[PDB]
Design brief:
Belongs to the IspH family. The protein has helices spanning 13-29, 43-51, 78-86, 97-111, 125-131, 147-152, 171-184, 198-213, 226-237, 272-284; strands spanning 2-5, 33-36, 54-57, 68-71, 90-93, 115-119, 141-144, 161-165, 216-220, 241-245, 261-266, 290-292. By secondary structure, it is an alpha/beta fold. α9 (226-237) links the parallel β9 and β10 (241-245). α4 packs parallel to α5 (125-131) and α8 runs parallel beside α9. The longest helix is centred in the N-terminal third of the chain and has 17 residues, at 13-29. The protein is flat and about 60 Å long. Residues 12-15, 73, 96, 98-99, 167-168, 197, 199-200, 227, 268 line the site of iron/sulfur cluster.
Protein backbone atom coordinates (compact mmCIF):
# COMPACT_ATOMS: atom_id res chain seq x y z
CA UNK A 1 0.00 0.00 0.00
CA UNK A 2 1.43 3.32 -1.16
CA UNK A 3 0.79 6.28 1.22
CA UNK A 4 0.63 9.71 -0.49
CA UNK A 5 0.57 13.07 1.32
CA UNK A 6 -1.13 16.11 -0.13
CA UNK A 7 0.63 19.40 -0.52
CA UNK A 8 -0.02 21.95 0.92
CA UNK A 9 -1.87 20.49 3.97
CA UNK A 10 -2.17 21.45 7.66
CA UNK A 11 -1.68 24.81 9.35
CA UNK A 12 -2.39 28.02 7.52
CA UNK A 13 -0.90 31.42 8.64
CA UNK A 14 -4.09 32.54 10.48
CA UNK A 15 -4.21 29.36 12.62
CA UNK A 16 -0.53 29.51 13.45
CA UNK A 17 -0.91 33.08 14.61
CA UNK A 18 -4.15 32.42 16.61
CA UNK A 19 -2.50 29.48 18.47
CA UNK A 20 0.62 31.55 19.22
CA UNK A 21 -1.58 34.41 20.48
CA UNK A 22 -3.17 32.12 23.13
CA UNK A 23 0.16 30.37 23.99
CA UNK A 24 1.97 33.74 24.47
CA UNK A 25 -0.88 35.20 26.54
CA UNK A 26 -0.73 32.19 28.86
CA UNK A 27 3.08 32.65 29.03
CA UNK A 28 3.10 36.40 29.69
CA UNK A 29 0.06 36.62 32.02
CA UNK A 30 -0.19 33.07 33.43
CA UNK A 31 -3.40 30.95 33.55
CA UNK A 32 -6.43 31.34 33.18
CA UNK A 33 -6.85 32.96 29.80
CA UNK A 34 -10.40 33.01 28.56
CA UNK A 35 -11.07 32.33 24.90
CA UNK A 36 -14.43 32.97 23.24
CA UNK A 37 -15.25 29.89 21.06
CA UNK A 38 -12.65 27.26 20.19
CA UNK A 39 -9.65 29.31 19.12
CA UNK A 40 -9.53 27.20 15.90
CA UNK A 41 -11.74 24.15 15.06
CA UNK A 42 -9.38 21.38 16.13
CA UNK A 43 -10.07 19.11 19.13
CA UNK A 44 -6.37 18.37 19.71
CA UNK A 45 -5.29 22.10 19.61
CA UNK A 46 -8.26 23.06 21.90
CA UNK A 47 -7.56 20.22 24.39
CA UNK A 48 -3.80 21.06 24.41
CA UNK A 49 -4.59 24.63 25.34
CA UNK A 50 -7.33 23.81 27.85
CA UNK A 51 -4.96 21.40 29.54
CA UNK A 52 -2.57 24.36 29.79
CA UNK A 53 -5.17 26.66 31.37
CA UNK A 54 -6.99 28.41 28.51
CA UNK A 55 -10.73 28.32 29.27
CA UNK A 56 -13.05 28.25 26.21
CA UNK A 57 -16.47 29.90 26.64
CA UNK A 58 -19.32 30.84 24.30
CA UNK A 59 -20.60 34.15 25.68
CA UNK A 60 -18.84 37.19 27.29
CA UNK A 61 -21.25 36.82 30.23
CA UNK A 62 -19.30 33.62 31.20
CA UNK A 63 -16.06 35.58 31.64
CA UNK A 64 -15.43 37.12 35.03
CA UNK A 65 -14.56 40.79 35.58
CA UNK A 66 -10.77 41.50 35.48
CA UNK A 67 -10.08 38.59 33.05
CA UNK A 68 -8.06 38.44 29.78
CA UNK A 69 -10.22 37.38 26.87
CA UNK A 70 -9.10 36.29 23.35
CA UNK A 71 -11.44 36.34 20.34
CA UNK A 72 -11.13 33.25 18.14
CA UNK A 73 -9.54 33.08 14.64
CA UNK A 74 -13.08 33.01 13.17
CA UNK A 75 -13.74 36.63 14.30
CA UNK A 76 -16.63 38.23 16.20
CA UNK A 77 -19.54 40.58 15.58
CA UNK A 78 -19.49 44.24 16.54
CA UNK A 79 -22.04 43.49 19.26
CA UNK A 80 -19.61 40.99 20.79
CA UNK A 81 -16.62 43.31 20.61
CA UNK A 82 -18.83 45.99 22.21
CA UNK A 83 -20.04 43.74 25.11
CA UNK A 84 -16.38 42.93 25.79
CA UNK A 85 -15.51 46.60 25.54
CA UNK A 86 -18.24 47.71 28.03
CA UNK A 87 -16.93 45.01 30.41
CA UNK A 88 -13.89 45.13 32.69
CA UNK A 89 -11.72 42.98 30.35
CA UNK A 90 -8.32 42.91 28.65
CA UNK A 91 -8.98 41.75 25.10
CA UNK A 92 -6.53 40.26 22.45
CA UNK A 93 -7.97 39.57 19.05
CA UNK A 94 -6.89 36.32 17.30
CA UNK A 95 -9.18 36.95 14.25
CA UNK A 96 -7.35 35.92 11.05
CA UNK A 97 -6.30 38.98 9.04
CA UNK A 98 -8.05 37.43 6.00
CA UNK A 99 -11.36 37.39 7.92
CA UNK A 100 -10.78 40.93 9.14
CA UNK A 101 -10.38 41.99 5.46
CA UNK A 102 -13.90 40.77 4.69
CA UNK A 103 -15.21 42.50 7.90
CA UNK A 104 -13.81 45.86 6.77
CA UNK A 105 -15.75 45.57 3.48
CA UNK A 106 -19.02 44.70 5.20
CA UNK A 107 -18.50 47.69 7.57
CA UNK A 108 -17.85 49.97 4.56
CA UNK A 109 -21.11 48.87 2.92
CA UNK A 110 -23.02 49.40 6.21
CA UNK A 111 -21.71 53.00 6.47
CA UNK A 112 -22.86 53.55 2.88
CA UNK A 113 -26.38 52.28 3.55
CA UNK A 114 -25.80 49.89 0.59
CA UNK A 115 -27.09 46.31 0.78
CA UNK A 116 -24.67 43.36 1.01
CA UNK A 117 -25.01 39.61 0.47
CA UNK A 118 -22.71 37.12 2.18
CA UNK A 119 -22.17 33.59 0.69
CA UNK A 120 -21.60 31.27 3.60
CA UNK A 121 -23.09 28.66 5.85
CA UNK A 122 -25.77 29.61 8.41
CA UNK A 123 -24.65 29.32 12.05
CA UNK A 124 -20.88 29.19 11.39
CA UNK A 125 -19.10 31.59 13.77
CA UNK A 126 -17.29 33.26 10.88
CA UNK A 127 -20.69 34.03 9.28
CA UNK A 128 -22.03 35.40 12.62
CA UNK A 129 -18.98 37.66 12.94
CA UNK A 130 -19.06 38.97 9.38
CA UNK A 131 -22.89 39.43 9.26
CA UNK A 132 -22.46 41.23 12.59
CA UNK A 133 -20.33 43.96 10.99
CA UNK A 134 -23.49 45.29 9.28
CA UNK A 135 -25.75 47.63 11.30
CA UNK A 136 -27.19 50.29 8.97
CA UNK A 137 -31.01 49.75 9.24
CA UNK A 138 -31.29 51.66 5.95
CA UNK A 139 -29.60 48.98 3.81
CA UNK A 140 -29.52 45.23 4.62
CA UNK A 141 -27.29 42.14 4.98
CA UNK A 142 -28.51 38.86 3.56
CA UNK A 143 -26.97 35.35 3.78
CA UNK A 144 -27.15 32.95 0.78
CA UNK A 145 -25.76 29.38 0.73
CA UNK A 146 -26.73 28.10 -2.73
CA UNK A 147 -28.11 29.22 -6.16
CA UNK A 148 -31.64 28.34 -4.86
CA UNK A 149 -31.22 30.88 -2.05
CA UNK A 150 -30.22 33.52 -4.62
CA UNK A 151 -33.34 32.75 -6.73
CA UNK A 152 -35.50 33.57 -3.69
CA UNK A 153 -33.76 36.65 -2.39
CA UNK A 154 -35.36 40.09 -2.86
CA UNK A 155 -33.49 43.23 -1.91
CA UNK A 156 -34.48 46.87 -1.56
CA UNK A 157 -32.16 48.38 -4.10
CA UNK A 158 -30.57 46.08 -6.60
CA UNK A 159 -28.58 48.94 -8.31
CA UNK A 160 -26.52 49.37 -5.08
CA UNK A 161 -25.50 45.83 -4.02
CA UNK A 162 -22.31 44.07 -3.19
CA UNK A 163 -21.32 40.52 -2.10
CA UNK A 164 -18.73 38.94 0.21
CA UNK A 165 -17.85 35.32 1.04
CA UNK A 166 -16.83 33.12 3.91
CA UNK A 167 -13.08 32.32 3.73
CA UNK A 168 -13.34 28.47 3.87
CA UNK A 169 -15.95 27.51 1.28
CA UNK A 170 -15.82 25.11 -1.75
CA UNK A 171 -14.17 27.19 -4.54
CA UNK A 172 -16.37 25.34 -7.08
CA UNK A 173 -19.75 25.66 -5.22
CA UNK A 174 -19.07 29.34 -4.50
CA UNK A 175 -18.38 29.94 -8.22
CA UNK A 176 -21.89 28.51 -8.92
CA UNK A 177 -23.48 30.86 -6.35
CA UNK A 178 -21.66 33.94 -7.73
CA UNK A 179 -22.80 33.03 -11.32
CA UNK A 180 -26.37 32.93 -9.93
CA UNK A 181 -25.91 36.29 -8.10
CA UNK A 182 -24.64 38.00 -11.27
CA UNK A 183 -27.52 36.65 -13.39
CA UNK A 184 -30.10 37.74 -10.81
CA UNK A 185 -28.47 41.08 -9.93
CA UNK A 186 -26.49 42.29 -12.95
CA UNK A 187 -25.14 45.43 -11.16
CA UNK A 188 -23.84 43.53 -8.08
CA UNK A 189 -20.27 44.43 -7.17
CA UNK A 190 -17.72 42.02 -5.55
CA UNK A 191 -14.00 41.15 -5.39
CA UNK A 192 -12.51 39.76 -8.66
CA UNK A 193 -13.41 36.11 -7.73
CA UNK A 194 -14.40 35.65 -4.02
CA UNK A 195 -13.01 36.04 -0.46
CA UNK A 196 -11.94 32.35 -0.21
CA UNK A 197 -8.49 32.52 1.36
CA UNK A 198 -5.26 31.32 -0.25
CA UNK A 199 -4.98 28.35 2.22
CA UNK A 200 -8.52 27.05 1.41
CA UNK A 201 -7.93 27.38 -2.36
CA UNK A 202 -4.50 25.66 -2.20
CA UNK A 203 -5.66 22.73 0.02
CA UNK A 204 -8.60 22.13 -2.33
CA UNK A 205 -6.25 22.18 -5.34
CA UNK A 206 -3.92 19.79 -3.45
CA UNK A 207 -6.63 17.34 -2.46
CA UNK A 208 -7.87 17.35 -6.09
CA UNK A 209 -4.33 16.21 -7.18
CA UNK A 210 -4.22 13.68 -4.32
CA UNK A 211 -7.63 12.17 -5.17
CA UNK A 212 -6.48 11.75 -8.78
CA UNK A 213 -3.96 9.23 -7.55
CA UNK A 214 -5.45 7.68 -4.41
CA UNK A 215 -8.39 5.32 -4.06
CA UNK A 216 -9.08 6.40 -0.49
CA UNK A 217 -8.50 9.82 1.10
CA UNK A 218 -8.20 10.49 4.86
CA UNK A 219 -8.63 14.15 5.86
CA UNK A 220 -7.22 14.97 9.28
CA UNK A 221 -9.57 17.57 10.85
CA UNK A 222 -12.38 17.99 13.42
CA UNK A 223 -16.15 17.58 12.61
CA UNK A 224 -16.83 21.24 13.09
CA UNK A 225 -13.93 22.34 10.76
CA UNK A 226 -15.61 23.84 7.76
CA UNK A 227 -12.49 23.86 5.55
CA UNK A 228 -11.67 20.21 6.45
CA UNK A 229 -15.22 19.09 5.49
CA UNK A 230 -14.73 20.76 2.04
CA UNK A 231 -11.58 18.64 1.47
CA UNK A 232 -13.38 15.37 2.17
CA UNK A 233 -16.35 16.40 0.07
CA UNK A 234 -14.15 17.29 -2.88
CA UNK A 235 -12.54 13.82 -2.87
CA UNK A 236 -15.95 12.11 -2.47
CA UNK A 237 -17.33 14.00 -5.40
CA UNK A 238 -14.40 12.67 -7.48
CA UNK A 239 -15.70 9.24 -6.47
CA UNK A 240 -13.05 8.31 -3.90
CA UNK A 241 -14.04 7.09 -0.44
CA UNK A 242 -13.02 9.93 1.91
CA UNK A 243 -13.07 10.10 5.66
CA UNK A 244 -12.74 13.04 8.05
CA UNK A 245 -10.81 11.85 11.21
CA UNK A 246 -9.47 13.60 14.35
CA UNK A 247 -6.73 11.11 14.87
CA UNK A 248 -5.20 7.70 14.04
CA UNK A 249 -7.64 5.86 16.44
CA UNK A 250 -10.57 6.73 14.04
CA UNK A 251 -9.10 4.74 11.15
CA UNK A 252 -11.18 1.60 10.48
CA UNK A 253 -9.25 -1.29 9.01
CA UNK A 254 -12.00 -2.01 6.43
CA UNK A 255 -11.40 1.48 4.96
CA UNK A 256 -7.99 0.46 3.68
CA UNK A 257 -8.21 -3.33 3.24
CA UNK A 258 -6.94 -4.25 -0.29
CA UNK A 259 -6.36 -0.62 -1.10
CA UNK A 260 -3.24 -0.04 -3.21
CA UNK A 261 -2.98 3.75 -2.76
CA UNK A 262 -4.21 5.79 0.21
CA UNK A 263 -3.95 9.60 0.34
CA UNK A 264 -3.66 11.72 3.54
CA UNK A 265 -4.26 15.46 3.88
CA UNK A 266 -5.00 17.81 6.81
CA UNK A 267 -7.24 20.84 7.10
CA UNK A 268 -5.85 24.36 7.99
CA UNK A 269 -6.43 23.80 11.80
CA UNK A 270 -4.89 20.33 12.12
CA UNK A 271 -1.33 20.02 13.59
CA UNK A 272 1.25 17.94 11.73
CA UNK A 273 1.78 15.54 14.71
CA UNK A 274 -1.72 14.15 14.00
CA UNK A 275 -0.76 13.42 10.36
CA UNK A 276 2.46 11.71 11.58
CA UNK A 277 0.39 9.43 13.83
CA UNK A 278 -2.00 8.71 11.02
CA UNK A 279 0.87 7.72 8.81
CA UNK A 280 2.20 5.48 11.55
CA UNK A 281 -1.15 3.69 11.78
CA UNK A 282 -1.41 3.32 7.96
CA UNK A 283 2.07 1.73 8.12
CA UNK A 284 0.92 -0.77 10.70
CA UNK A 285 -1.87 -1.64 8.32
CA UNK A 286 0.62 -2.33 5.57
CA UNK A 287 1.56 0.98 3.99
CA UNK A 288 5.14 2.04 3.16
CA UNK A 289 7.14 5.27 3.30
CA UNK A 290 4.78 8.24 3.03
CA UNK A 291 5.51 10.06 -0.24
CA UNK A 292 4.69 13.83 -0.39
CA UNK A 293 3.18 15.14 -3.58
CA UNK A 294 4.82 18.20 -5.19
CA UNK A 295 2.76 21.29 -4.36
CA UNK A 296 2.14 24.98 -4.59
CA UNK A 297 4.56 26.86 -2.31
CA UNK A 298 3.02 28.79 0.63
CA UNK A 299 5.16 31.66 1.99
CA UNK A 300 2.80 33.88 4.07
CA UNK A 301 3.29 34.32 7.86
CA UNK A 302 1.12 36.59 10.10
CA UNK A 303 3.02 37.74 13.26
CA UNK A 304 1.41 38.00 16.72
CA UNK A 305 0.64 41.55 18.03
CA UNK A 306 3.74 43.23 19.36
CA UNK A 307 2.19 43.34 22.85
CA UNK A 308 2.28 39.49 22.77
CA UNK A 309 5.93 38.88 21.61
C1 LIG B 1 -9.26 29.46 11.74
C2 LIG B 1 -10.06 29.80 10.67
C3 LIG B 1 -10.72 31.13 10.21
O1 LIG B 1 -10.93 31.03 8.66
C4 LIG B 1 -10.30 28.75 9.65
C5 LIG B 1 -9.20 27.67 9.63
O2 LIG B 1 -9.51 26.88 10.74
P1 LIG B 1 -10.92 26.34 11.35
O3 LIG B 1 -10.82 26.83 12.82
O4 LIG B 1 -10.85 24.76 11.03
O5 LIG B 1 -12.22 27.15 10.72
P2 LIG B 1 -13.29 26.73 9.67
O6 LIG B 1 -14.39 25.97 10.49
O7 LIG B 1 -13.95 28.05 9.19
O8 LIG B 1 -12.79 25.96 8.52
S1 LIG C 1 -8.23 29.14 6.65
FE1 LIG C 1 -7.70 31.11 5.72
S2 LIG C 1 -9.03 32.71 6.65
FE2 LIG C 1 -9.26 30.87 7.97
S3 LIG C 1 -7.56 31.17 9.53
FE3 LIG C 1 -6.53 30.05 7.83
S4 LIG C 1 -5.61 31.67 6.48
FE4 LIG C 1 -7.14 32.71 7.84
Amino acid sequence: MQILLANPRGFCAGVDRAISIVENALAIYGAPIYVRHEVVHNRYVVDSLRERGAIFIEQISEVPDGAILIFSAHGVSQAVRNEAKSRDLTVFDATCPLVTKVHMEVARASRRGEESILIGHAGHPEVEGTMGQYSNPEGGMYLVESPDDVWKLTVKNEEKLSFMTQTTLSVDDTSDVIDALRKRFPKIVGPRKDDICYATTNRQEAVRALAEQAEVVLVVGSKNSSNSNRLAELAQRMGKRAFLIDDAKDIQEEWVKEVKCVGVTAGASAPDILVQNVVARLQQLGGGEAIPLEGREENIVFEVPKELR
